[PDB]
Amino acid sequence: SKGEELFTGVVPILVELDGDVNGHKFSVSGEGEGDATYGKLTLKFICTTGKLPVPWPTLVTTFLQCFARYPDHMKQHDFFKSAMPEGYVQERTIFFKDDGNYKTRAEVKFEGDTLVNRIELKGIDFKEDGNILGHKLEYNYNSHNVYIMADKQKNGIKVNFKIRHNIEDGSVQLADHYQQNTPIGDGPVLLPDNHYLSTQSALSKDPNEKRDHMVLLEFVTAAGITHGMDELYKAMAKETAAAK
Amino acid sequence: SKGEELFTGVVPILVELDGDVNGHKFSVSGEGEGDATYGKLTLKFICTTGKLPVPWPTLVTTFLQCFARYPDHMKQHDFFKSAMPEGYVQERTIFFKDDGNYKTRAEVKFEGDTLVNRIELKGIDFKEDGNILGHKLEYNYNSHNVYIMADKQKNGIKVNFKIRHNIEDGSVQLADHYQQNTPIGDGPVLLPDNHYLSTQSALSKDPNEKRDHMVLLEFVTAAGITHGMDELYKAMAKETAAAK
Amino acid sequence: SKGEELFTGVVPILVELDGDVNGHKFSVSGEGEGDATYGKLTLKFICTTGKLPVPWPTLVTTFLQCFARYPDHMKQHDFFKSAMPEGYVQERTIFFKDDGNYKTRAEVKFEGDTLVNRIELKGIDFKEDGNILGHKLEYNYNSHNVYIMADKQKNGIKVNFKIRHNIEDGSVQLADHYQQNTPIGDGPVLLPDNHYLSTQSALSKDPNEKRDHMVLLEFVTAAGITHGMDELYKAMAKETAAAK
Amino acid sequence: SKGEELFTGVVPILVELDGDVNGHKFSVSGEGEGDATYGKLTLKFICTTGKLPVPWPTLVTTFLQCFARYPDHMKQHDFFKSAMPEGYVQERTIFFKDDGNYKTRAEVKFEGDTLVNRIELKGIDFKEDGNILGHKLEYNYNSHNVYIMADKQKNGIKVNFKIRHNIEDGSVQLADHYQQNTPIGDGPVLLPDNHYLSTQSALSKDPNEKRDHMVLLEFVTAAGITHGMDELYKAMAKETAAAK
């Protein structure tokens, strides 16, 4: 697509979120960079309202799928870059098992050379001493598969996945994500065949930062579609032995 | 700084210029808005005296650096917002290679909620069939780096950069900009370490406007100062592999 | 309009008011200047009869909408300047919630180079220990939106807005303003589409003034009408990325 | 080493090269996978700039020695995996007999789960009708031994080998490779005793690919170090006969 050309190098990223969880209001600003050639995101988020009232790991998915590394053979399945520069609206309902839920609406688009993710989040029905409001999540993050399918009717995609959040007592808190992305622009977009994004995330702290923050390193790679290269490598293995 | 708080949302902008180039007198009024969070300027300029006697692109730099997006880690280097609301005086000498020069003096300050840029410009020594008076510039604009350094003696900044104006025959007309900014107020200002502003500008016409005008979309982002985040991301990459 | 040409520079202002509130008679003279290009008013009012018998903030709205800054794209909606130099009659009923009311009639017109506002005010039904006669208003002023609509039948405008006056105990005293303006002259006037004036006011005292007085700084800007510039800036953002 | 644990399964590979040979600029992107347990590489390279200006076989060595199968008894001699995940810099000078030379600098390191090989190549002094610029190489590849020795002073290895490129007229074009690898990380690395890598490569084309490309299947196995197992098998042969 034409949109994929906007991601050939390192792109600066800006993230802005306004949130309200069980009436606790907060805002977060994030900055970093994305390098889609390597599916690499390097970001730092700062809570601009003081102390974040929920654990940082619960917001990782909310805080840039246009930076996924799509293998060459899957390039016709990259809806995210195809929607650029006009961007897409990313909407989610996130259900925390045995607890409350987050509802999010984000606009992801270019503002000049900067890729901007602007989000509004609302959390309701959280338990006072649940894993979220009780701050029982470990400050770490598992690897996951993000399942994507085309939504022809809406000229977009439907996305589903389940995040496993480690809890301090060795248990796991599931967060079932229901997501949809729709293009902002009027131009054609790529509607993909079913596939997934394999994600790996690491969380850290900046030792010189006094504000409540999160440093995130993420790697995102598309997979799940093949183009029969295995048969060609098997044929090459057969022809070599036949000559040697 | 306290001045940076004045730029958290969208700010209306008013630009007023009185000019005289080789004795040709003209005035321009501009309106728009600035959103420093995104380093975004959206402006429309109208020549109120009839036909502008110089090409619109030659005046782009003269017609709002307080709207630059300064990354969080560079916030102590933003002289422009720190001088607000009292504002700053922005003075330039602009040398058009092999041609005349512009000398400008502007006061940039708030008038209530409106950020106002009031300018006087004088152009001398222009050649009758040069690129400027001969109107040989294309109606477009390149991206540039604006170099900033502190001027401790004047409690301000010195700024230097070279604009590349495309000419209709494929050649380029350089415009070397020498600039200084000094605060109007008595309060403390931020004197920055050396850095630059990366600028991108697009020019257009309003299809329903009959007056001589210019529509400008500009993105301005500060860069050139780092705070060693690369080493932290490298350490995160090393710790993940060590655990996985 | 032809009337708008009378406001291109700084215009001296004279305000004269004769008032009677619950039988307490007073007079006020004000002087200052208006700069409609910046929507800026700088005025000083002196009570010429001794002590003002009502709080100064209650009279701010009574004491110059012809000085509003109308954006270029809204210039066909500026009734106030279009009525000049002949001027307009500005009439109001101001209801102080749970208290009395003011009725005012003013003539606003040029007398040579001076813009003059001559007012008669009558206040009735005020409570002895209400916020007004009890002098319980703080000496400050909030920002408001002044709603304007055309009154085709009267060749003028109807204006409505609600002032929030802060009270010393943290409560707010509302003052609902009902206003009409009719031209004095026979010439054509501009009848506007619905819009509003965004106002900001600051109150102070002259440290060298011994008379009962008020120093006022006000900024007035018209808003509420757009001319689809957002679509043009979105198209410019789309064309730049398509070329870069 | 700890680095060897990163190679127990199939690892996705990304190769990126920017090249300039006698002023002819080109870029190549490659993808595939490596399975070090079997010393197996399966890769596909695409010239992203159009037609590759040199024969594909000349670039095979430039386009992943960390995927060599090291026999268990030689595991203390595997410098390549020991440098991971931080990686190593691989530098070469490649002399084409009676013709020009290539100079290359590559960084090989993990980016999340992906093993990335980023290369810059510069070729100079090539003859217009030599085997390289004259495109006289057959599209095939011989088997070779890659000689490795420790470079204690640089905490790395020196590598030397000679590639035999078949020419269309039955002659052979030699390419003498001089190579050095140095670790990027600060951690300890394995400095090996002298040994070699035995390589076998097959080249093919993807029948559904219209871009200029190369499909490569490579097998790499370390050899040249023994741990006296022959004497143990001889002793077993002697003890069996002595009992039977």
Add this chain to the structure above:
Amino acid sequence: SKGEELFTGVVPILVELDGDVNGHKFSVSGEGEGDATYGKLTLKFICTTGKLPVPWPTLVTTFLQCFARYPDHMKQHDFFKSAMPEGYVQERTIFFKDDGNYKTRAEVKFEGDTLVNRIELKGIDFKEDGNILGHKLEYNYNSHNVYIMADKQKNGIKVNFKIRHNIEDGSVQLADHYQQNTPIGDGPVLLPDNHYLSTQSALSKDPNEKRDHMVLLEFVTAAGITHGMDELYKAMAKETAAAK
């Protein structure tokens, strides 16, 4: 066959096994070499998961019949080499008399110059104090005949034999092997007449190895098919005496 040409010299071998016996999980990696001209295998196996939970001799048959020495006159009966390089699937059920059973599935094929045997094994119904889980087998191995017949329907072979494992108390533990081999490739294979492989195996330990391991020396020779050479030697004996 064409496959037999791949075995004229010494071939490196890699063996990989993942096993689960009565829920005890383990993995084994083996390396060595095979010389089919002499029917000779020299291998060393290492348990990579720590202590092997079953006696090493029970796994000997699971851990390369393509290395059998087939006499020249029986070369048309060598199914194993004829299936190469694509390889064959070797499946077994092994019944330990009065005890549990192993079920195995292996793929034996070339990966470049290396002959690879990849196996999955599942053992069930073993007695806690039986000869296997009670570790009562001696660390030695008897000689056996491996009976082969064609399986025309499956384009492969059926193999049957009974292993005699010596027990520490002088008794013998039988292991009845039921085996089938099917080609992986689409090319023609040799379907043999009934014959057998005569096997001899010796087990030892590497005196410098601290990991749980087994050193194996095996000789495998095909027999059971003659081509009437005895009558020719009898005729030669008769003709010599008739002349002398």
